[PDB]
Amino acid sequence: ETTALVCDNGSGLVKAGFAGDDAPRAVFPSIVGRPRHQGVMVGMGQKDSYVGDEAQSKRGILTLKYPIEHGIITNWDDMEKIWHHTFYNELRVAPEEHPTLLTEAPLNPKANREKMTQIMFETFNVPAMYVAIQAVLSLYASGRTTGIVLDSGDGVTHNVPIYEGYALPHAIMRLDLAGRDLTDYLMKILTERGYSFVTTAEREIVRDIKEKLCYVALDFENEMATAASSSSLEKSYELPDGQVITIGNERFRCPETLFQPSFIGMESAGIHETTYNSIMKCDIDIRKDLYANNVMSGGTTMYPGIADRMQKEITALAPSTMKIKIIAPPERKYSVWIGGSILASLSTFQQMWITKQEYDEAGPSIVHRKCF
Template identity: 25%
Template sequence: MATLVLDNGAYTAKIGYSLEKVSIIPNCQFRSKTSRLKTFTANQLDEIKDPSGLFYILPFQKGYLVNWDVQRKVWDHLFGKEMFKVEFADTSIVITEPYFNFSLIQESMNEILFEEYQFQSALRINAGSLSAHHYFHTKPTELCCLVVDSGFSFTHIAPYCRSKKMKDGIRRINVGGKLLTNHLKEIISYRQLHVMDETHVINQVKEDVCYVSQQFYKDMEIAQMKAEENTLMRDYVLPDFSSIKKGFCKPREEMVFNGKYKTGEQILRLANERFAVPEMLFHPSDIGIQEMGIPEAIVDSIQSLPEEMQPHFYQNIVLTGGNTLFPGFRERLEAELRSLAPAHLPVSVILPENPVCYSWEGGKLLAHTPDYDEMVVTREDYEENGHCICEDKFDI
């Protein structure tokens, strides 16, 4: 029987059969300014000639799956002929859901998977649990790990001991990639150019030029300098979707500091925005969100756990999710944790090679474990016992 692993994130779906490679596909629908009437789903984004003013229709709001119509259309597209050609009667699915998901959402998901699509069996699980499984698989001698999952809607910190999550230690910070992109849109719109409708383009800008500062105040001083002295300044060429399909950063030696560029390119000049936006992951209070940053939340999580286990968690902190890809993120987090943690305990923060697909890879490994058949709910079980069998089996 084939096993399909779907890490159903709020921004991208990571999907693939357990014997194949992963595909990363936008988990949403789009409408563009140029063709208002047509709706594009998932990877049909590539068909849009002019993605300026792209309007996103997301199935997730604040990290929870609320728009089932959009989600169904995305899944129909993923499971359909163009993509994975799923034979539902012979396929088992591993699908992720957020921590502390609402029971109504869980019931709807059970119904759709078993009654509409009629999968042979299903396993609903947190993405962090798959990441922990992956970590323990690569380091079988370790007993504990702390998964830091910084995604589109939230950042979750979740401790695991022997693949069991410790619910008392789970922390959530309401800062994710969506908030960072929106904040960057506001800053650029206020200072330079109205880009509030350009989510797609500014998200690309964020991924291309933002980084996590190691010394925030020192970088702030550099960012205030004029012309060539400002070594942090970058000029970003915005796409016009005719000759320039994708925005890019101008090489430093081609930057013009006094006067204008000869070419008709539209330029964004970025200085302190480059590091002030990702700084919100460490200091949400900078923009009025009264919450702890990631380092404090990690320490708070570890301190809520039994004392004899704490050293193990400090030594096995695993980063997953798109925000951990900012250059300097791991180094800054490790430095801040070092200053907060007890002096005698070693601190180690691990950034996997591909933090975005790390939990998907964990699902792939899980599908090949001997216990897998014990963990799933089959369609027969579901038809006989209803939702209660899922609640008993899935430790969410």
């Protein structure tokens, strides 16, 4: 009778909804706002803290804080506020009679998982729980049982190879370079044109202009020479005060940090070299099927032109005798949640739930034994 809830807790955006549906019921950015100015008006509905889209609407008078930093929950009171808002105010449901599925990045610290188990079996008193890896849900939504998944959120960019439903845990790659670092790099490179962006509302504006006006170059050097010589690549954006800015070559230097991490000073390899070493760390028999199935998910793969540059770099790195095809569906930023709608819908999954009873006589540590 009961229908399970699915809550994709990413790093910047939270997607919560019911199992079996095609699209998430509530998508809103996971932020907590607090007022940085004194209040002169008596009344006004002056809440001590703002959450969700309400904080995003009046961000000019709010200091905004992200409770998730690099896929790791730092502030927990903000997270119980986020989960209370998405349970009671958004979905308008009671958690006492609903199973609940969570998404977590691999190679995460363990105490995050026991505190996640602790802070919702005791407070919201759910009758079931499960925590799953995001890339497994990406293959569930993709409808195939084989491939290597590049998932890049706001904080974590991880590569997971899975062959015939059997994941290889030694081949799991994790990088801390994602869209927040791209936002910070876009803050850094806009100072040459003279536009100053320092505050968190300005960080939201930099995230919006990164969402609307960025793309990946197929080749960096020739398009840099084209932007230096010609005057066709620039575009205009309208700031919400009324000012208009013009951006030339910065709209393709920003995602290039994904392929060249030395721009922000990170020593580690690019995302193409990370994917190629993740394929190279796997066994020799399964690499042929892994070259033919490259699955993407997350909003950071929403830059136009990521697939062609990705295919060119993997085709350069791999030997030429292999065919390389990249699956990039246009609904992939909501991909992982749809896998949750695959996962709770199955009757085979219905006995591996962590109910209240095994949580009582084992403590939080049961989430290590059951989940993953």
